[PDB]
């Protein structure tokens, strides 16, 4: 295609996979499995599932901080995810498990304008490319899946659907602690 006679239209596509060494990269396998590659060796897995893996209502972050067995980058990423949730006020909707340096978090997404809506909005912001599978309305978005599970994992050939991209995490970095409610007077 030529414009004004002499000019010719040409394109490029940026390879957002060489940035793994310094930038978390969102990613998607299928509608019920998305991924965040923190490094070549390790990453986080975000699934939307009917079935749960944490059957209790304890997160218990303080003991995990005291033990200090978890991976710091993964903890930072899930902290960015949680603090990015707008108007999180139901603590019982979240449970966790950090035994032996593990990272596992569960958001109970069990109608318009609730905690599940905020968790889902942060989910589609984190995995921006591929989460649209799981428009017109945004103020309350709902999926048939009941639970959102965040876990640690080893990195593999996970990006089957959408290309990797750092844009979701870099966009959520600026949004931390913007819509959090007050829970204590002295804060």
């Amino acid at each position: 295609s030529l414009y004004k006679g002499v000019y010719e239209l040409q394109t490029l596509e940026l390879n957002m996979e060489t940035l793994n060494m310094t930038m978390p990269l969102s990613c998607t396998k299928n509608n019920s499995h998305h991924y965040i590659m923190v490094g070549n060796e390790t990453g986080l897995e975000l699934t939307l599932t009917n079935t749960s893996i944490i059957n209790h209502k304890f997160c218990n972050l303080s003991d995990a901080h005291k033990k200090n067995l978890y991976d710091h980058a993964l903890m930072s990423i899930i902290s960015t995810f949680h603090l990015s949730i707008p108007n999180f006020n139901q603590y019982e909707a979240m449970s966790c498990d950090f035994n032996g340096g593990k990272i596992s978090v569960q958001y109970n997404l069990s109608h318009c304008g609730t905690v599940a809506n905020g968790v889902l909005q942060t989910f589609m912001r984190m995995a921006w490319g591929g989460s649209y599978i799981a428009c017109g309305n945004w103020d309350c978005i709902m999926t048939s899946y009941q639970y959102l599970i965040i876990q640690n994992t080893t990195w593999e050939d996970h990006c089957q659907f959408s290309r990797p991209s750092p844009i979701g995490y870099l966009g959520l970095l600026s949004q931390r602690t913007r819509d959090i409610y007050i829970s204590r007077r002295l804060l």
């Binding site: 414009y3 004004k4 940026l14 930038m23 060796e41 921006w128």
Partner: protein
């Protein structure tokens, strides 16, 4: 605050998909020091920062993302990503930061600043959707 990172331009094979040594002139990359709503300049700053990070800084035993958490604001305008998200939710074309388009003279090497190919409804927009933008760009090229 406004971005500041100096783009210490040539895109290598590793930075690109199915391409080899796309090099833009000084005039094209000079617009990244002033333009604020250009996705390509932000990604250029990100790639240059990644390059200098792997080259200069010693790799840690275990990876950490403190440095990117600190330099994200200097390397890129987060509000551009915010605007792209806003266009994404409102069911109108947006940029996912992957594909860009520019114009080169067939007789000279002088290129324009690449602009993002807007995606809409899960697919790239046709060239006829934003042909007016291409013509306006070429008009500014002949004028400038």
């Amino acid at each position: 605050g406004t971005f500041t990172w100096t783009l210490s331009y040539c895109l290598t094979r590793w930075m690109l998909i199915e391409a080899e040594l796309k090099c833009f002139g000084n005039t094209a990359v000079a617009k990244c020091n002033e333009k604020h709503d250009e996705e390509f300049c932000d990604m250029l700053r990100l790639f240059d920062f990644n390059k200098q990070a792997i080259q200069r800084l010693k790799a840690p035993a275990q990876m950490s993302i403190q440095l990117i958490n600190k330099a994200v604001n200097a390397l890129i305008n987060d509000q551009l990503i915010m605007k792209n998200h806003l266009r994404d939710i409102m069911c109108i074309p947006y940029c996912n930061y992957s594909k860009y388009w520019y114009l080169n003279h067939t007789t000279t090497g002088r290129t324009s600043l690449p602009k993002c190919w807007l995606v809409s409804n899960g697919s790239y927009l046709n060239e006829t959707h934003f042909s007016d933008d291409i013509e306006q760009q070429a008009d500014n090229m002949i004028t400038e």
